[PDB]
Amino acid sequence: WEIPDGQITVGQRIFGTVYKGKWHGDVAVKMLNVTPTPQQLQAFKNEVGVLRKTRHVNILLFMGYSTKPQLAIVTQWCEGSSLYHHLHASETKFEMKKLIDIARQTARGMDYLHAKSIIHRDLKSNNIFLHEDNTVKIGDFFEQLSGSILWMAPEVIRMQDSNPYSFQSDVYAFGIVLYELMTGQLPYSNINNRDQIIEMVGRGSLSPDLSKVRSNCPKRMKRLMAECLKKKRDERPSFPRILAEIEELARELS
Amino acid sequence: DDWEIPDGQITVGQRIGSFGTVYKGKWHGDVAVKMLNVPTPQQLQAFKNEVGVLRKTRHVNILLFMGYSTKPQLAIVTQWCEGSSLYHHLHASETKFEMKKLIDIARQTARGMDYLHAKSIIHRDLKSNNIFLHEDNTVKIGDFGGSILWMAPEVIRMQDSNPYSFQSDVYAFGIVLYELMTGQLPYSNINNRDQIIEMVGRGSLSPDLSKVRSNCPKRMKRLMAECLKKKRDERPSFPRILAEIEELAREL
Ligand SMILES: CCCS(=O)(=O)Nc1ccc(F)c(-n2cc(-c3cncnc3)c3nc(N(C)C4CCN(C(C)=O)CC4)ccc32)c1F
Numbered sequence: 399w400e401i402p403d404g405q406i407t408v409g410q411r412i413f414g415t416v417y418k419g420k421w422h423g424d425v426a427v428k429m430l431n432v433t434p435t436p437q438q439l440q441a442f443k444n445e446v447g448v449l450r451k452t453r454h455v456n457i458l459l460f461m462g463y464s465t466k467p468q469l470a471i472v473t474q475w476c477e478g479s480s481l482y483h484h485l486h487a488s489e490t491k492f493e494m495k496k497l498i499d500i501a502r503q504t505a506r507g508m509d510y511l512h513a514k515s516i517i518h519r520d521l522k523s524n525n526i527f528l529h530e531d532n533t534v535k536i537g538d539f540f541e542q543l544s545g546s547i548l549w550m551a552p553e554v555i556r557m558q559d560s561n562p563y564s565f566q567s568d569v570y571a572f573g574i575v576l577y578e579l580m581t582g583q584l585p586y587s588n589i590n591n592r593d594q595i596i597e598m599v600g601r602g603s604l605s606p607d608l609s610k611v612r613s614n615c616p617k618r619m620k621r622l623m624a625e626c627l628k629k630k631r632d633e634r635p636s637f638p639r640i641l642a643e644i645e646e647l648a649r650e651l652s
Numbered sequence: 653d654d655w656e657i658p659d660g661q662i663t664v665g666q667r668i669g670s671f672g673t674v675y676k677g678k679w680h681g682d683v684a685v686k687m688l689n690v691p692t693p694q695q696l697q698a699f700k701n702e703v704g705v706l707r708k709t710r711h712v713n714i715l716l717f718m719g720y721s722t723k724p725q726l727a728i729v730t731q732w733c734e735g736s737s738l739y740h741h742l743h744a745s746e747t748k749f750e751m752k753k754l755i756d757i758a759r760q761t762a763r764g765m766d767y768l769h770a771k772s773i774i775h776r777d778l779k780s781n782n783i784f785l786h787e788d789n790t791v792k793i794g795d796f797g798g799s800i801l802w803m804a805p806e807v808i809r810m811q812d813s814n815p816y817s818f819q820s821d822v823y824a825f826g827i828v829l830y831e832l833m834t835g836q837l838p839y840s841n842i843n844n845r846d847q848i849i850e851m852v853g854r855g856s857l858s859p860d861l862s863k864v865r866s867n868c869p870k871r872m873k874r875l876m877a878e879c880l881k882k883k884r885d886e887r888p889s890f891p892r893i894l895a896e897i898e899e900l901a902r903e904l
Contacts, residue, residue, distance in 0.1 A: 399710075405770075422770060422894075423713060423763035451654070453710075453718045455731045456681065461710045474712040506681035513680065530787060641680075 399450060403466035418475060425461060429470035437542055442469045448539075451514060456507035458527070458537035473537070476529035481575075484528060485582055494614040496532055497579045498651070501619075502644045503534035508572055509637040511536075512565055519563040521571040523578045566631035569640070573626030580611040580619065602629045618647045653700070655707065659723030671777075671795060672728075682732035683718060687725050699726055702797045708771050713764035715784070715794040728797065733786035738828075741785060742835055751867040753789060754832045755904065758872075759897045760791035765825060766890040768796070769818055776816045778824035780831050819884040822893070826879030830859050833868040833876070855882040871900045 406427065409419040419427045432438065442463075449460040449471065459474040481500065484490050504526060511518055518539045525538040541547060541558045550558075577585050585606035589595050598604035605627060608620050622643045628634045662685060663678045672686040699722070706717045706728070716731040738757065741747045749757075761783060768775055775796040782795040800811065830838050838859035839848050851857035858880060864873060875896055881887045 422711065422767040423760070453655075453716055454680065455716060459710055459712060459716070476712075503681070510680040530790075533787075 399462045401462035401464050401472060403464060406464050406472060419472070421472065424475035425472050426475045427470050427472040429468040432468065434469050438469065446471070448516065454507060454510045456503045456534050456536065457510060458535045476527055476535055478528045478530060480524050481526040481528055482524035485523070485578055486584060489582070494612070498619065498644070498648050499532050500528070500534055501576055501579055502648055504536070504572065504575065505637065505641040505644050507534060507536045508568060509641045512568070512637050517563055517565065518568055521568055523575045526575065564631065565636070566634045569626050569634045569637065572640070573623050574606065576623045576626070577606045580615045580623070582612065616647060616651055618643065655703065655719045657719040657721045657729055659721065662721060662729060676732060677729070679729065683729050684732045685727050685729045687727040690726055696722070705773065706797055709768070709773070711764055711767045713760045713791045713793065714767060715792040730794065733784050733792055735785040735788060737781050738783040738785055739781040742780070742831055743837055746835070755872065755897070755901050756789065757791055758829060758832055759901050761793065761825065761828060762890065762894045762897050764791060764793045765821060766894045769821065769890050774816055774818065775821050778821050780828050783828070817884070818890070819887045822879045822887045822890060826876050827859070829872070829876040829879065833865050833872065834863045835865065836863070869900060869904060871896065
């Protein structure tokens with residue numbers, strides 16, 4: 399899928415540098431300013447290999463990768479903004495039907511990812527793009543420092559090996575996104591302190607209150623959302639059941 | 653080779669077409685499954701090669717191939733799009749489309765065809781019925797999937813022609829432009845299959861450009877006529893067509 403250098407035309411810039419380019423129509427190319435790094439080259443190869451096996455309407459359409467001018471990924475161009483900008487920044491009055499439709503499409507995309515054992519580690523409402531309208535597209539998804547291995551303390555050695563991301567973190571992020579959709583605001587809106595939220599969520603003391611959900615939201619949706627926010631990882635359900643429940647609730651509520 | 657959807661995962665539904673029988677199925681959301689009346693290894697290798705041809709297509713304006721199934725029946729599974737075919741919009745429904753929407757549909761089809769030809773892919777059955785309008789303004793294109801020594805010089809010449817090429821595709825694109833601008837199928841007066849076949853084969857008949865809408869620009873009609881050249885070599889290449897269409901869209 400390597401696109402030659404001369405074929406790709408660069409355009410306006412809108413981590414990593416993103417630019418809206420023109421290549422057989424509108425595309426978006428993300429390149430990193432480097433002149434690169436072999437470690438970054440291996441990471442780019444792994445990211446390209448992960449992105450190549452993805453074909454779904456609700457997943458962003460990867461179109462190619464370029465390596466000659468700068469290590470870069472070229473995908474389709476979609477008109478609109480992120481769900482974070484729609485709900486939080488503009489506070490657009492979204493009908494409950496549009497909310498449950500966005501939820502169903504996000505669930506389709508996540509079920510597709512998990513069916514391929516692909517782990518979207520940074521799933522958030524800011525990485526959920528709304529092409530046109532009511533069309534969801536998802537994107538923006540080992541001690542390398544070999545020399546300083548001996549001098550680091552057991553505090554930092556143990557931290558580098560940790561691998562917390564799994565399907566359960568993804569379903570928790572999906573539940574938080576459902577909270578954003580239904581309430582219309584970021585969770586823990588009162589607590590404007592990062593450290594407090596981090597500590598209270600790490601100790602499981604704080605969870606987003608489902609009481610602030612909009613009155614138009616059905617009860618089954620809130621039940622599924624609360625089920626996805628289980629503190630214990632194993633209690634959280636798998637995404638096929640989530641998609642089935644969302645589709646059933648949408649069919650019931652027309 | 654690694655895109656086969658296993659059996660039982662795909663749930664079939666109502667038939668929405670009957671090249672191949674089309675059905676709206678459910679597999680990680682709404683999908684569309686096209687099935688073939690055919691299980692033989694010789695045919696299986698050809699199906700695998702066709703799948704490999706379909707795998708090198710990733711474009712917003714090209715229909716999204718999502719997988720192939722061989723266990724219950726040999727079938728191709730792609731995305732599901734809400735809407736109808738451009739043929740249904742213009743001819744069957746006669747939806748009042750603004751000239752901006754028409755030139756945008758033309759630009760999207762041109763992007764898709766230029767991408768296909770850039771991959772050295774020859775869409776042999778290009779027609780306005782294979783252009784689906786997802787939502788109501790997103791174009792999706794699909795339906796594009798020896799005894800030589802013993803043959804006499806009379807019959808050998810027929811094999812050497814190879815009539816399908818990029819020029820046939822740009823001719824079909826010109827016919828699609830005619831449908832877009834006029835709003836009706838070409839040769840509406842004749843309505844005879846054999847007569848039209850003969851007269852177009854001898855180059856005696858061309859779609860009458862007088863029935864074109866008044867709103868259509870002159871550059872668009874010029875490009876359309878350039879794509880309908882009887883001689884294959886006179887027809888322009890799709891990159892130049894895409895550039896001209898983009899410039900005309902920016903101007904208007
Ligand atoms: C992607 C690689 C290219 S491919 O060469 O491999 N070919 C291929 C492979 C697999 C496929 F499923 C379809 N295919 C999908 C829909 C589809 C339908 N509805 C929503 N989304 C998609 C569809 N519709 C079709 N017809 C009959 C039209 C005609 C008129 N209509 C009216 C009057 O209403 C509606 C529909 C025909 C084929 C269709 C393929 F073209």
